[PDB]
Amino acid sequence: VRQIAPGQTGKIADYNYKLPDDFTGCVIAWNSNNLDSKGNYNYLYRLFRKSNLKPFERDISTEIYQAGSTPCNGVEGFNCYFPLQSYGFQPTNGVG
Amino acid sequence: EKGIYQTSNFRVQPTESIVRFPNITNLCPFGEVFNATRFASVYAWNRKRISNCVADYSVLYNSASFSTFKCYGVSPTKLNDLCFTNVYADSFVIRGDEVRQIAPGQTGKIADYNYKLPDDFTGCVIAWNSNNLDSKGNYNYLYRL
Amino acid sequence: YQPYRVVVLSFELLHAPATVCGPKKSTNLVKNKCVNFNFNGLTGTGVLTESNKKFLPFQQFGRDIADTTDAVRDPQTLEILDITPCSFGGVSVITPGTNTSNQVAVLYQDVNCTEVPVAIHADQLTPTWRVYSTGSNVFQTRAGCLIGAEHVNNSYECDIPIGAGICASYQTSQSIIAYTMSLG
Amino acid sequence: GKLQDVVNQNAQALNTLVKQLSSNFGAISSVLNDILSRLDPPEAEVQID
Amino acid sequence: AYTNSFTRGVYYPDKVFRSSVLHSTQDLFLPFFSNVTWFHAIHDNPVLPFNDGVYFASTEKSNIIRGWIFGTTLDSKTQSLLIVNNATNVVIKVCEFQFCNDPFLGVVYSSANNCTFEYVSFKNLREFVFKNIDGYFKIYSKHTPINLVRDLPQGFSALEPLVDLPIGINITRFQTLLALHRSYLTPAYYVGYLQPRTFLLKYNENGTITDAVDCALDPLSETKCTLKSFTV
Ligand SMILES: *[C@@H]1O[C@H](CO)[C@@H](O)[C@H](O)[C@H]1NC(C)=O
Ligand SMILES: *[C@@H]1O[C@H](CO)[C@@H](O)[C@H](O)[C@H]1NC(C)=O
Ligand SMILES: *[C@@H]1O[C@H](CO)[C@@H](O)[C@H](O)[C@H]1NC(C)=O
């Protein structure tokens, strides 16, 4: 939640949601362990991107990541990555 | 009106962006640690003094013998900037299906004798796959349950 | 049933002196042209040139009376380079007044007239500006490089001063001239 | 000596102006690239100001 | 057991070349005409403090002084530091030495384990400026001839930056190590200390500290410091 702010870093702020530095608005957040847990494997987020986002840009593309120098195609093999992984939500976990 | 008027400025712009630095010449002993002929257990430890050692991390990644890399504190592209003090490495032996069980806050099979850790110890993983030297009398290793 | 093994890399930082990290690889050095440079951390912009200075083998760079860096040692070939700034100056427009004409001449302070179409970005300009970057009306004053005025050998009174004895005026088609001024 | 004082006063004033570029005025550095290589421009802006 | 320095003990404070420049510096220096202790070993190695720097000078005939033990507690509990020259090379090893009450060399002594790192590199006067700032350890030195009886001279020569070390310990006290022929185990050199001062260094054509002025020596040297010139 600290990454939803102007000029913050982290993989939510570099790869998913980039607020501009000259932002005018509000950011509102609340704990939702009532409904969003039980795990759940459709709340995803991106781990890999070849360059950072600009302010207010989204991206949907399941291109496998060139993380090995030699290329791979279509199939995740060696040093090939599907960029969307999930959150493991379970109500036994501590807050954070 | 008639006169002379100072209106603008001009400036010649640069063309290149050259980089000069000393010779990368203090190489590190990367050869007698993981290309050696004797390895350890969780029973036995080697605490090594990795210092006065400025050598690369790319062949630790871009070679064809180490399998898995997922790493939170740094991206493999910029290994050049971040420079670490008190570098420590210790060798072990773990069976096959215990890959994904050393992680920040991990409760798998081996959390109590392979020292479960939060993300105080940030760093990547290196996964060499032996296929010939481990194969066939080499029961020298130790473990407690 | 595979002898698996991964090693996690070390703990926290800003903690002690010499560290353990990767290489800092180098580009080839190029001279006599305006470049961006990085010599062991010291960053600037300027023109490099082999110097007639020689200093003691523990010294890395030089400074002058006002603490400006004006020499540097290459950390591979232990040679002493000079640093001079890239060319800058003012741009001044000579007009006879809009209620009389609309033709102008341009003075570029402290350049040669061959260095002008790269000092200004003439290919990135309006074609009506590329008139005043090259041509046949080109005169080298001590005030700079005058472009757009005809250098004659008469002497008149000063009308629009330029500097170091040179003036300009609107004279008879009609044009703008540049002459040494007469004292009487 | 009256002509020498005009040369000395003008040359001393220009040396004071150039030596004032080594002051940080309360910022973390007086070099403008070192602020732009160790901070991000939310609060690197307030150090350049 | 006390003499003065005159102008002895100034070093190069940074790696910047200057020429025909008077420059004003604010570092840890040895003040001019100060009180330096005198230890002669003729018939004497105590556990002297390291406050914020130590000047050392020791002239010899036949190479008796070897090196220095630094550290904090001197009890084989805290990290200690060491230098020994052998007429082969130099060794600077940062072990946790088991210590004795007379650590000379024999005509030798090493109880070193749990170490950190290591490095291998009359007509005499041999000067040394030790310093431990920001987790570093610097060493400045020069050796030079003499023409005198026994005293420190009144010439001028500036000391070069020999070797900086990445140590990172806490340091409080030190002790020298010089040898003697017979081994007596029980179960000649000056020392001055550095203070924060302000100096005015003169650089010549090729760039060498030729003169200096201590700006707090006397009221005439304060006038040279204000006008930034050597003549008033
Ligand atoms: C650095 O390596 C180059 C090899 O191209 C050599 O010419 C140069 O002398 C070296 N500099 C040193 C060792 O300081
Ligand atoms: C310029 O001249 C015209 C006629 O030639 C006149 O009408 C006009 O007022 C003049 N401009 C000014 C600013 O006086
Ligand atoms: C202009 O060009 C001439 C070439 O004849 C050169 O000698 C001179 O130094 C130049 N003047 C400058 C760059 O101010």
Ligand SMILES: *[C@@H]1O[C@H](CO)[C@@H](O)[C@H](O)[C@H]1NC(C)=O
């Ligand atoms: C001025 O005299 C010089 C002498 O070389 C001549 O070359 C030049 O063309 C003359 N200019 C004019 C316009 O009289």
Ligand SMILES: *[C@@H]1O[C@H](CO)[C@@H](O)[C@H](O)[C@H]1NC(C)=O
């Ligand atoms: C320095 O040595 C002189 C020797 O004459 C002595 O009188 C003096 O007390 C000592 N200390 C100081 C601070 O001058």
Ligand SMILES: *[C@@H]1O[C@H](CO)[C@@H](O)[C@H](O)[C@H]1NC(C)=O
């Ligand atoms: C400085 O160097 C020059 C040339 O290397 C030499 O002639 C001169 O004697 C040197 N020493 C000085 C100026 O003290």
